Amino acid sequence: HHWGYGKHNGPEHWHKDFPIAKGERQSPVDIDTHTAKYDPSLKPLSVSYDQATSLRILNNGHAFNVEFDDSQDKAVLKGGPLDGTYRLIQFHFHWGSLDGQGSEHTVDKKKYAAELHLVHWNTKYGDFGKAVQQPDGLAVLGIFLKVGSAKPGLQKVVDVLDSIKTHGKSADFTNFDPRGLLPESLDYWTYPGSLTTPPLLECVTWIVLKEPISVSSEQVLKFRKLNFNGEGEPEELMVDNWRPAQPLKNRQIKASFK
Ligand code: NA
Ligand SMILES: [Zn+2]
């Protein structure tokens, strides 16, 4: 793809190829915690990941995705602001060149070191490619990472990064349990938004958890060793693969808690 995160092809250029970049329900956004409305009608999230089947990890030239088998209801998200059952298809992260930036959402303008996105699609639409064309097609769970103590459940991911260093590399990646990436509390903010990379489609109910998880400096350092480029091309380190906050426009952020 021509788009990327550099000076000449980065997010401030994306609108020329993807005019929806300047749409009414783009993501990410800044979550202003004092303007977010507590909504007592929001249910707890229901995360059922006990039967998750991970398959593969892949460097796609803009992040790395861990991909899951989504041919049956094995790892699903329900409840919260959702109607219906959303199946987990992949997760990936966005991170920075330094620990003070890297997240896409911000909370009262505070940036975190990285942000994990667990991407799920509405099973009523039959496949992911049909789901992205619907306003309620995707639900993405967003979790912030701060740098502090190591997260043991992330280490299996960081160990394999060496084997997918360049764009197009993939590796078998089975028996990874994504329950090891969740914080203790499932309290959340939610708003209607978009994919944060091209094609930027406005098909996402965002569910952003309040509680960050901690990872160690050494764990995030290993993300920063990946490359945007393919093998045998000039080295460009995969860092700062985040899109800046977009205008909220005519949207309300709701909170599941006070
Ligand atoms: Na992708
Ligand atoms: Zn993402």
Curated annotation (Swiss-Prot):
The active site is at 62 (proton donor/acceptor). This is Carbonic anhydrase 2. Keywords: Acetylation, Cell membrane, Cytoplasm, Disease variant, Lyase, Membrane, Metal-binding, Osteopetrosis, Phosphoprotein, Zinc. Zinc. Can also use cobalt(II) with lower efficiency, but not copper(II), nickel(II) and manganese(II). It comes from Homo sapiens (Human). SMART domains: Carb_anhydrase (SM01057). GO terms for biological process: angiotensin-activated signaling pathway; carbon dioxide transport; morphogenesis of an epithelium; neuron cellular homeostasis; positive regulation of cellular pH reduction; positive regulation of dipeptide transmembrane transport; positive regulation of synaptic transmission, GABAergic; regulation of chloride transport. Catalyzes the reversible hydration of carbon dioxide. Can also hydrate cyanamide to urea. Stimulates the chloride-bicarbonate exchange activity of SLC26A6. Essential for bone resorption and osteoclast differentiation. Involved in the regulation of fluid secretion into the anterior chamber of the eye. Contributes to intracellular pH regulation in the duodenal upper villous epithelium during proton-coupled peptide absorption. Activated by X-ray, histamine, L-adrenaline, L- and D-phenylalanine, L- and D-histidine, L-His-OMe and beta-Ala-His (carnosine). Its cofactor is Zn(2+); Co(2+). Transmembrane segments: none annotated. Changing residue 196 to D/E: Strongly reduced activity, but enhanced zinc affinity. Changing residue 195 to A: Reduced CO(2) hydrase activity. Zn(2+) binds at residues 92, 94, 117. Coiled coil: none annotated. The modification Phosphoserine is found at residues 163, 170. Changing residue 65 to Q: 2-fold decrease in enzyme efficiency, as determined by kcat/KM ratio, and efficiently inhibited by chlorzolamide. Interacts with SLC4A4. Interaction with SLC4A7 regulates SLC4A7 transporter activity. Interacts with SLC26A6 isoform 4 (via C-terminus cytoplasmic domain).
